[model samples]
Target: EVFKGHNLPRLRGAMIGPHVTNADLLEFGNVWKANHIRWQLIWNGFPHSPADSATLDEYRQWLDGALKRLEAALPVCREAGILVTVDLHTPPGGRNEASECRIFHDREFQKAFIDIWEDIARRFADSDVVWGYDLVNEPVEGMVPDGLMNWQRLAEETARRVRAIDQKHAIIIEPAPWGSPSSIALLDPIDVPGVVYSVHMYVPHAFTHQGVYDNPVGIVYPGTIDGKWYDRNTLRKVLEPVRRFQEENGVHIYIGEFSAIRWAPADSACQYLKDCIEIFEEYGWDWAYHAFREWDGWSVEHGPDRNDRNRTATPTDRALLLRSWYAENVKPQFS
Candidate 1:
């Protein structure tokens, strides 16, 4: 349990992935004595030719297995005094390139979608290790028109259903445009009380995700370390809109995701990470990092190293650095 407020849990965490198992989570808890884990469940095979609808049974089976995994990991968290939350990561529209892949436009998909939430509630309704559900991950504008009621309504209605079933837990809702401040205006009030508001901040994406091989936007940050764009004040400026929204709405604002690309030199990246800490403390918002591992396998030091000076970070070295940095800097909030 974090610093308690009325209907709020002071947020601090790191996002872990689908490949990470319950055993891994239990081990993580043992290592850090952490109080939380942002559990990611990725369902990559979706509305494409081998449709998510067609594979619904398989999806449910996987969901059942994953929830079982979480349920099994719960006693560990409870013993360790940790809380856990579920993040449903349906692949973004931009990444899954099929014409029929539009989840927002399809009615059957939307209906089935709510069914999934109801199913989740049914499975975990009684568990206390569960904190809340992140309804969607980094939704894009193309998911629907800029201002669509159905998209907004479905989320609220689903939350309504979840709340009806499990009144004690918080439900986190995120805005679109990859969860940028630009799309905060799209949010409408969900009928549920005691809900959590989340947004993903990867400000000036050019700087944060530059040179990512699979990035479709492929926007590059010009100055690298020389042109690094974050400072504590600037980070606060970036989060101001969300802070304002939280103040107006009187709900806890959780920055559910944020991170910089590992290619940006480590010293600069560390400063960038520290700025995020200042902003979260200054605003009193719950926040978490977007990711922790570097998947690249070609270079070392997310920096201007003489050995791998111009190349991006290699996956193995990136993983090693993440653990070492956590030991030296971040300490333990995530398990």
Candidate 2:
């Protein structure tokens, strides 16, 4: 629960499902009984440039596409009885071949990054269904050039800029080196009233992200990971920083994404989700699962088989677990 009028109802949902279409979003809402969705605006890669006109124009086109999808979803989400966060999943200057977000290194990219969010704020100021602006996704800060702005300062400035144009929405900020909870303890709260903190949970990466990158393939949750014992308690210890941040700052927090790959051995993934969610509820924080019907690897309707993409006719344990959680919500009514 956040502040009044701008508040969300104990949100429990997933990121936008298969498509940005009205039908897909509504289906996830009605089928999953989700009360929230995150529209992760994917920015196509742009080569690095020092105010290159062609690159700037290309980014504008990219922004236009992302905005169109977001605007399309806002009214559809309202109809579905869900709130949303406009996530800048990709940003200007794009990622390098090595996958680092160039915004951390280049001043020009940071400038463009801030401006695009303000433009979004100007456009969607009055939409109540639009709850927050997730300024960046999984920001990977690499070597900084002289006088380059860091993530915290950038988050603070961006929050102020958006607040100037749209005071109704929250600005979600995440800690760097890729939004890990381990780094959240070091995060300082922004001065703005409605700012919300965000973190992505793929902890014990060997387990949750296994098979995707194709490394450490045999790891499982509630078992030894990286030669260290890990269970639900260890998972809680990993997320304790976020809980402490809320306790210390008295601020709202959201889990922008968290899920284990469906193919983990022996129903491991299901228990992982159950443990993580139980932790989330204990703190009364809102969350969005890593996805919903977004990929075969993350799909709940699909059984735990990396080789299969076919949706199950009946609910999988993962799907039923999510359904059980969504059952707690008052599914918003529509005629």
Candidate 3:
């Protein structure tokens, strides 16, 4: 569906590794037939700047190496027939805790953010495999510093800058509160044409994230928690506002990320995935699973014998469910 003149492509993809090797891209494309990938780039010592005294020189020096890696990856994606949305997973302004919110408050960091987009736009202006720019990943509500710009305001400004440089590619924007569907609904749409509004789905997070890396254990889907019923219908209710927003604003929605934790029962995870996929299909929105190979937690492949040794460690059954849906729904890229 991303490429015009073709029936909507189901995407049938995942968020892949940052700076993923070409071999991994080829394997996913040939083995899983995943047509798209949300490629992430976390800010880890990028630009190497300090408070109050950095210049564009440091920014350009850091971005040059980053761009080279990105450019190299594009060809590999083209060979794999996979579209890539460059997702800024960790941005200059951090998301959650007070210590990470420096970019939101610092004028220099904000300028670096804009400049990053500007540099990226100039480089990938003609890339076909590079699908779009996900301006920032999962912006959080109230992360903006007091008396400074809000997420929406800053995102829009950055988007406008990207648009000014590159008009041919689509721009992807996600709502705040960690890109949750409910948080997205309460916000106003970014008024940029050909832009896709994105969100991350982890509804009933208690279940999907149960026992996932420091979280508590033993939560299940279609069950009660604290006197509240949680199931497919619950997901629908949470997404209702997003659905309505699309219909009312005449915009396209892209679920940039979604998946159940490794510990979730396969049947339940499959059901949860199926429910989400069906809803996405009904709405004609684009989506990608949380990940394909970055972490073992979301891995679909099972260990030896496909038994329960790591039963809670893999989601083979759920993977099959998604593969089935893709076989029936995804539009083939080539004859």
lDDT of each: 0.59, 0.80, 0.71
lDDT of the structure predicted as candidate 2: 0.80
TM-score (all chains, Cα) for each model:
0.75, 0.92, 0.85
lDDT of 1 by residue, 186-210 (tens): 7875767768888877776656665
lDDT of 2 by residue, 1-335 (tens): 44422444578888864255778777777766788888877653222322232375787787787788788777788878888888887787677766677777777788988898888999999887888889988777777777978888888898899999996788888898688998897678888767889898888889998887667566777899888998899999999999999888888889999999888987899999999999999988888997886777888888877788798888889989998998887654433
Ranking by TM-score: 2, 3, 1
* Model 1 stretches with alpha carbons more than 4 Å out: 1-9, 44-55, 91-101, 141-149, 214-230, 292-335
Each prediction's RMSD over C-alphas, in Å, is 5.9, 3.0, 4.4
Residue 201 miss distance in model 3 (angstroms):
0.5
lDDT of 3: 0.71
**Native-structure RMSD, model 3:** 4.4
Error at 143, model 3, angstroms: 5.7
User: How does model 3 score by TM-score?
Assistant: 0.85
Give me the runs in candidate 2 sitting further than 4 Å from their true place: 1-8, 44-54, 331-335
Prediction 1 TM-score vs. true: 0.75
